[PDB]
Each structure stands twice: as C-alpha cells, then as structure tokens.
Amino acid sequence: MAFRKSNVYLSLVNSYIIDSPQPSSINYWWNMGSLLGLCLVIQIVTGIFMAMHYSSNIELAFSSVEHIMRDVHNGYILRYLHANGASFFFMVMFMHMAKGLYYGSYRSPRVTLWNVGVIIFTLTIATAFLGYCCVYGQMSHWGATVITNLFSAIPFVGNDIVSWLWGGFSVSNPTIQRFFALHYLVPFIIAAMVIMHLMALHIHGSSNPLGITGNLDRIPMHSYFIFKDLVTVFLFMLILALFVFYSPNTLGHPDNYIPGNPLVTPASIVPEWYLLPFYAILRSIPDKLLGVITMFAAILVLLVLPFTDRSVVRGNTFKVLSKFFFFIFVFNFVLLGQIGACHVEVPYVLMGQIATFIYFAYFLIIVPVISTIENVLFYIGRVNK
Amino acid sequence: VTLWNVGVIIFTLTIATAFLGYCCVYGQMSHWGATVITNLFSAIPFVGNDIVSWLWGGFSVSNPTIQRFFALHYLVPFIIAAMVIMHLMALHIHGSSNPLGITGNLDRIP
Amino acid sequence: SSLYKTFFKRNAVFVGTIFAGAFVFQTVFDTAITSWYENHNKGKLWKDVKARIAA
Amino acid sequence: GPPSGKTYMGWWGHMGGPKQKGITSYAVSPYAQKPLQGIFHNAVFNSFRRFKSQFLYVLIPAGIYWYWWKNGNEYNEFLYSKAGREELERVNV
Amino acid sequence: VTDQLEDLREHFKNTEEGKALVHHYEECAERVKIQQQQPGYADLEHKEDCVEEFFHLQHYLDTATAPRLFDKLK
Amino acid sequence: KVEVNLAAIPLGKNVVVKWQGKPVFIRHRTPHEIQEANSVDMSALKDPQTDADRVKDPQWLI
Amino acid sequence: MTAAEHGLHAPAYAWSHNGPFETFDHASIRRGYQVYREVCAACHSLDRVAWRTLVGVSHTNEEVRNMAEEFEYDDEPDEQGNPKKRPGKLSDYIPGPYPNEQAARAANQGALPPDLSLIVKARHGGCDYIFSLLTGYPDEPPAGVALPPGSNYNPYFPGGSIAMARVLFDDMVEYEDGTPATTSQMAKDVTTFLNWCAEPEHDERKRLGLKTVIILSSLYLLSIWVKKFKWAGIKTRKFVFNPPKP
Amino acid sequence: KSTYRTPNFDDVLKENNDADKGRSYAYFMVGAMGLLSSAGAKSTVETFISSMTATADVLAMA
C-alpha cells in the first residue's frame, strides 16, 4: 500500500488529515476547529519567546514586560500577538461552541466529544487568567486576589486553601511566581486534552448541517477541506493583524499599564470581555457562597444538554421554535456581558438577575419543553388517523 | 530500527535538557559550561561566531543567556515526553525482543 | 492566457522558482512601501526636522 | 491488533451506509470548466436567499434585546441626572 | 499671541446656542448663591450645584472647538 | 507592628497605612458621624454589631 | 453614576498621528520635550525613558549627550571603597525630581505626581484626555461646588477635585524653533511627546502593519479562487435515480 | 432514464477555443499563493529569531 498508509507515524497523519472521510455538505462553521489549533500554536510560540526575557519576581514582573515592549527586537509584536491572540482564541471558541449547540453536535454518539470540550474550555479560562496575572498591573493584582478568594466560599477549610494558594498573607511574591510557573504548564495539558478531543471525534466522525448521516456521500479531507481551511486561516490572520498593528490595546484595560498596588483598588473595574458574562452572573447573587456556586454552574450546565434535548432529530436546521429560542439564548448571553461592564445600579441589577434566570432556563426548561412540542407537531402534521 | 533511531534522538534531547538545567544554578561550573557548550558552535565556518553571539543574546554569557536557558529547560522535557510516545508506538508494532534473540510468538503472557 | 504558457508552458510553477521569486519580492516590496510611507509623512519625520535644524 | 469497538462510521469501502443501487453520478473536470468569473449574472440574484429565510429568527430576538437594553439605559441616565434624584431615592435602597 | 483655544471658546460662548447655555447655567448660579446666604445652608444634605448645567455648556464648547483647534496650531 | 501618629490626622479625613501588606483604614470621625454610627438598629444589619463593639475611642475608627 | 463622578468626556482633537498611515510629528515631539523639562519635570518623573531613545527621534546624538551629562548618577566605588558620582551617559534613564515616594508627597500636599512614561496608555481617552485636562482648568469652579483646601477643579478629571493646579500659562516657554508658546500649543506638544514615550514603536509599527495587511489581504483573496477551482467538480456534480426492479 | 444520456453541463463548461485557459489561471493563482506564503513564512521566522539577538539596552560601548 502507499507509504503514507504503512508507516507507523504517517498513517496517523493520513487517517486524521489526508484520507479522513468528511460529509460532503459541511459548511464554514466546521472550520473553527482548525482555527482553534492555530490559536493554540500562536499562543505557545509567542509565549516561549517572551519567557526568554520575562522575570516573575513581583518587583520586576511589570518592568520586564515593559522591557519586552521597549528593548526586545520585535518585542511589542510578540506581546500584542500573545495578548490579542488570547482574545481571538475566545471569540473562535464561542463560535465553535455555539456551532455545536445549534447543530446538536453534543448529541449521542458524540457525548464524550462534547464533555472533553467542556474540560478544555475550563482549562483555557484558567490559563488566560494566570497569564493575565503575570503582567502584574492593577487589574492583574485584584484579579489574582478575587479569583483566589473564590475558594474561601468553601466551608471550614476555605480560607486555608486560600492562604495556601497565596503562599502567604496576601497576593505577593510567592503568588505571581507560582502563577507564572503554572501559566507555562497548563497549555501543554490543553494540548493533550485536544488530542483526546480529536480521538473522540475520529470514532464517529463529524456531523453535518442536515443533522442526518454522512455515510452515503463522503469526500477526502485532503484537498477539499485542507484548502477550504486555508481560506479562513488567512481571514483570521488578516483581522488579527489589524488589531496587532493598528489597535493593539482596544481589547485590553488601561489600568494594566499601572503597576499593581496592594493598598488601592481602581474605582472602576471591568474584567476581560470574555469573562464579563460570568462576572455579571456572580454579581447578581447577593450571597457569597451562592454567588460562586451559580457562576461555576453556568459552565457545568453545558453537560446537561445531551439529556434535556428531547428531540428525535439532530440540530435546529428544520426547527422553527428551536431556532428562535437559540437566538434568544445568544443575545441574552451578549446582554449579560453588557451588564457586566456597567455599574451595580438600578435598572442593571434587575436586568442582570432576569438574564441569569433566562440563561439557566434555556438548558433546563425551554429546550426540553420546546423539543417535546416540536416532536408532536412533526407527528400530527402527517399522520391521518 | 525505527525504535532504535527514536531512542538516539531521545538521548540527545536528554543531554541537552540536563545541561540547560545545570546552567540554571548559575554556579562556577554552570557559567563555564554555558560558555563552553555555546562556543561549540563557533567551529562552524563563516557564520559560527554569529550563531554564538545570537545564542548568548549579547557580548558574553549574561542575563539574556541564563533567562533563555531557563525558558528552554522547561520546554524540552515535554518534547522528550512526546518523543517517548513515538518510541512506544514503534515498540508496539513488533513488540519486545527477548534474551534468546528469536521469536516470541509461540509463547506470550499478558 | 498565453502570457503564462510562454514562461511555464502548461505546467505549474516549481518550488525553486517560487522560493527565488519570494526573495526578490521581499526586497522590492519593502522598498516600495518604505518609500510611499515616508513620502506620505513628508515634513513630520526626523529627516525633515534635522534639515530645519542647524547646530 | 486488539479488537475494536463498534461505531457508526467505517472507512472507504465499508463506510457503514445502506447498500446503494440505481443512483448514477456524473461530473466534469474542474480543468474543463469556465474559469471563476461566472459566479455573477447567474449566481448573484440567487445568492442572499439563504438569509432572507433566516434574518427573522435573528432580527426579532435581536430587536427584543436591543429595546430592552436601550430602555434600561435611558432610565439609568435619568435616575442619575438632576431631574431624577427624587425618583432615585425612591427606587435605590 | 492670544491662546487659540480660549479664542475659539469665546467665539462660541457668543452664538445663539452658547448664549442659551450660559443663561441656563447663570440662572442656576443665581439660584445657588441665594440658597447659601439663607440660614442653615451648612446643615441641609440637599445642597444644589450647577455642575450638570456647567457640563452642558462645556460639552457644547468641546463639540464646536475640537474639530477646529488644531488647524490653527503648529 | 505599625505606629501611626494620630495627632497628625485632620478632622473628617481618611488615612491609609500598610500593616502586614494589608491596608489599615483610620478615620478621625466628626461628632455627627459618631451619632449616625451609634443610632442604628441591629435588625438593619446582616452582621449585628454596635459601634461600641468596634471602636475603643468613638473619635477613631480603625 | 453622576456626571461629576465619571468626569467630562474628552472630545476628539485632530492629532496628526491619528490614522493608519500617519507617523508622529517629530518637531512636536522635540518641542514637547522642552515643555516637559522646563515645566513638568519639576514634579513628574519619566523613569522608563532612556536618553539613547531620544537620539534620532527628537534630538541629535550630540544634543542628548550634553543633556545627559548635566545630571549625576552613582558610579562604581573607587579603588578604596568610598562611593563616588559621575556625569550621565546615553545608557542611563532620565532622572526624576524626587528620591522616594515620601519626599514626593511632602512636596505636593501629600499627593503623588504619577510617572508619565505610560500615562497616555494608562487612561481612557489617551491624548484627548491629557490635552483636555491640561487646558481645561476654569478660573472659577461651577456654583455650589465645595472645593477642598489645596485642591483644584477640573471637569475632565473624575470627581472634579484634582491635586494638580494649572501649570501652563501663555509664553512661559521660549520655543527654540520660534513657535508661539500659547497654552494650547504647549499642551498639544507635551502630549505628543508623552504619546511617544509610551509608544516609541509607533511609526515603525504602522509601517510593518501596512506590509502585513497587504500580503494577508492578497493571500485571502487568492485562497478563495484556489478553493473554488479545487471544488468545481463536486459543486457541479449531478445525480439521477433509476428505481431497481425487484 | 438511460445512463448513456449524459445530463446538461452547458452552463458550466467553457466554450473550448482556448483549452489551456482554466489551467493557466489556476496555476497562476496557486503560484502566487505559494510566492506570498513563502515570503510571509520567511518574515515570520526572521521576526522570532531576531528577538533573541542583543537587546537595545545591552549594547553599551564601554
């Protein structure tokens, strides 16, 4: 047989990238996965090169980043690429996730595929946050303070886990140095998790926009999808280029250009845009313990979808009620984000509380109810007795 | 053969890893070792001394050197891990050999 | 397009010719850009300011 | 190698679909086709169609959320201006 | 010479729109000093200021002077 | 162990000092503030405490 | 939140460096440096800027060398161990007016004039904000505002009460290039110089950007064409069904 | 229908007066893509590598 088939190493590449049978009808929404691998590489590469010039000590961290910005040849390109890359990493991840939601990609027999993806999402949030703390700006310090304190909510030992995590009395030199060590480690765990994601994808293959079987008409990954992936890879790079060279700080916060100060918290704190929806959910619960539990639940609830989707067909392509509600969910998520950027003031607090309700209700009430109703409608519209 | 060749690559990567770690202590031996091993590249004709000043990130073994060495010491072990997986993949296709040097296909145990 | 068939004759362009062209492009393009750029900002640059200075 | 678990996808020659018969496909080499330029005049009015059927599912939920946002915002602005400092003390605490 | 920004501000404080705005601010300033001279101003927890009215004025000025101030500078 | 010179702090002003890396607030309260503090009912507090249980000298909130 | 708390929104001035294809105005940077030295340096440090970075940007190699030598820095101890001073060299960083944070507060009613090296990137509004703050001090605060002793009113600053008084007044600087030193002209200059301090890579970054965007745009368009060609056989593919007899 | 009667492809087929028309365009496209891609790769590689060279703050002439 061909060498690409017989060689122990090449056959892996052949089965995953060259001869892999793809459903002839997949659309550009299926291009986000490769875009996610690309993002992972860009983050690792630019990160290692900057690590060569970075100092983790609390007295030097901020200045070492400035050193990367002012003295390292092409240093600012590395930092703006790494920083803006993290944002682009989340924009693409949400689209990857939303695509799965809309087409019922989370359904059997791809449950394992969906669950591993949830784990990756969590690991990515943890990674970006740790990286954020390495700049040691004003936002960095308080973020490191808030997130680590999240654990004090645990009864009895909670405050202990916290002083442990800090390695002292407060967010200090033992904190930022362990955060750097950890920021370097986690990306390699994501890589291993990405491999398990791909292994799970390979056993049943990709789904398609029609939601039905692809077994009757497949075309090779090689040529068709390699070249189609190239189209979005270049588009992705063009847009990232525009931010990196023309508007490098639009997705950041001015407060991070101010060194961290243990005694003063900024008058207006607005977290990273991709964390805003979660920040709003946290803020909407006037109880400490319940506040953190509901926030974590906002992520874990994604695990419930394979069971609450009562439909008999996969995906929202041929479903009027489901498409409509799908978009209520999308814009509700954006709203939550907008609320997160506002002050805890009158019309906003109640709006935040209702939006949070709607978010959870989609998974637990709307989907099961709507899918059941749609099942029946499909039946009585054709049976004549 | 493939099993043996991947093993040679691992050996090289391990030597490189331990050496970089050695330089992180920055003791007397560390500094001179970092100096000698990086200079090993000046032996290359024409560009050799350039590769060296590049590797150092300056006039001599200094602050840009040790910091890049630490970054590198952390990275390489994960490449060894991936290489160890390829080593195992190559081992799995034909299995282990045995002290008699002949086939094991007539009597195996789990 | 017969303009293509004169240089490559019904065959695709080979790596060598691609790499060679890439090295040429890199230099020509960079000069074209640096030129247009400096001309667009004439009067604002240090070159321009250095002339208006005498010390 | 070790026995593998049953899946819903095979490989070329045993993909797992039902036995096909009666269907006949035809195709023409991309090399013999009109160079990419005919995607107009014939493929222009046909386009944009796959969004005239969808925009409602996107527009209505968008509209609903935009007005809700605009309403609450304008209310906030009023509450913190001079004119609304009275109502602010009412709804605040 | 005279400051280019102050020149443009002055020019705009004298338009129909600017006069209307200085008036509203003026009417506020007036209403305020009268409240201060009366007994018990120190203890009132409802002391009015004219910041809001001042901001409207300043905003109008900014809107008019911002796209023109640099054409006059070097 | 940190020493703060109270004689230096003005009337209704807030001063902040470092103690074990943690910020220490110190306000020289006005007579009106002292009344506001000690005139609040426990039913209005989720964590019930009299101003007395919190300050030793009503003039200094620490 | 009340307008007084947020602060008056800074309007959009037409900076010559705004725009994808625009470089800083180096003459303005030069002037700005003078305004910084003669006015601001009295209370503001510029810790992250090194003398050498001025060469070829706003001053000649010679000019910067003369400027750096007017200041003293700690040199390496002598043959016997006693400390000794030394004039400045290009490798050094522009020195600040105060030896420590405590002395900085003592000289400013207890306030701390922040370092201006990143000020333009460390505030929403950027250049528009800095300029507006500097030229926005009214002779008298609006009616009703109880301004604390030692403070000043400025509408652009959050809360209105700022610890920095107006420091720019007409003709307080004698511009070496002849330009009329009006308060707005000076504000316009320092701000430009402060923008350069925070983003020294500015001019170069935008040049590289133009190259990057042209190549990627071209690559993007080209890929579409290639993809369509490679897909034409599948796209125009046609099927026919002929029900098999039993 | 008879399988020998090939369906209509007139709308897609190019009136072959210039046989090597689509080939010349496709090959030019692929070629230009390869040209610009190699230039980009070269620039990217050079950007990372030169970031390891001596920094601006260490080139002091003693």
Ligand code: HEC
């Ligand atoms: C000492 C007498 C000063 C001179 C001369 C100048 N500044 Fe200043 N500045 C000073 C103080 C005491 C403060 C603190 C203000 C506060 O309330 O915290 C400042 C602050 C600034 C700021 C930051 C303002 C902010 O948004 O937080 C800026 C942007 C600033 N100063 C700029 C500036 C410039 C450019 C000057 C010369 C033209 C200048 N200052 C002079 C004290 C003094």
Ligand code: HEC
């Ligand atoms: C050591 C290798 C390294 C890896 C691997 C790495 N980073 Fe980083 N990252 C850094 C360093 C060094 C910094 C500090 C410099 C900086 O601010 O960019 C940083 C900073 C960050 C920041 C702060 C950006 C800012 O505003 O300055 C974020 C966010 C981030 N990383 C995200 C990621 C993500 C997401 C990944 C991977 C999926 C990743 N990083 C992988 C080294 C790495």
Ligand code: HEC
């Ligand atoms: C919460 C879910 C989730 C996350 C996060 C996730 N994936 Fe996926 N991924 C899926 C699902 C489900 C599919 C199956 C899509 C289908 O066939 O409908 C999938 C499919 C893929 C594919 C196939 C092509 C495609 O886009 O459909 C690739 C490649 C892939 N994912 C890569 C990644 C990478 C890389 C990451 C992130 C580092 C990631 N995924 C994170 C859910 C996820």
Ligand code: HEC
């Ligand atoms: C230069 C050679 C070489 C190096 C170095 C090497 N291996 Fe091997 N390895 C072999 C060969 C050859 C075999 C086959 C042994 C046999 O069956 O006779 C083997 C077999 C193995 C086995 C099977 C059990 C055994 O010991 O025979 C394991 C497990 C293994 N290697 C792990 C590793 C790991 C882990 C490393 C280092 C990080 C490593 N090897 C490095 C040559 C190497």
Ligand SMILES: COc1c(O)c(C)c(C/C=C(\C)CC/C=C(\C)CC/C=C(/C)CC/C=C(\C)CC/C=C(\C)CCC=C(C)C)c(O)c1OC
């Ligand atoms: C079934 O459906 C599929 C499908 O299966 C696939 C695979 C794809 C294609 C996409 C992919 C395969 C994405 C895969 C991505 C990955 C495997 C990424 C793995 C990630 C990594 C980060 C690798 C780790 C890298 C390193 C350790 C090295 C980097 C560091 C270096 C080189 C330092 C060098 C140092 C010096 C001093 C020079 C599809 O598009 C698709 O659609 C239908």
Ligand SMILES: CCCCCCCCCCCO[C@@H]1O[C@H](CO)[C@@H](O[C@H]2O[C@H](CO)[C@@H](O)[C@H](O)[C@H]2O)[C@H](O)[C@H]1O
């Ligand atoms: C990641 C870094 C990117 C580096 C650059 C990207 C790769 C560029 C590869 C460029 C050229 O590689 C070149 O491709 C063309 C196909 O288009 C090959 O052509 C081959 O296939 C074509 C097409 O059927 C035939 O006409 C031709 O006779 C044959 O030799 C050519 O032999 C090879 O040399």
Ligand SMILES: CCCCCCCC1=C(O)C(=O)c2scnc2C1=O
């Ligand atoms: C899934 C985890 C979501 C993270 C929520 C924490 C968001 C969050 C806060 O709640 C906060 O108070 C501060 S202060 C500086 N940064 C932050 C921040 O990111």
Ligand SMILES: CCCCCCCC1=C(O)C(=O)c2scnc2C1=O
């Ligand atoms: C395979 C690589 C073998 C490494 C040989 C270099 C050994 C070696 C030297 O030659 C030397 O002069 C010094 S000085 C301090 N340490 C060393 C050292 O390890």
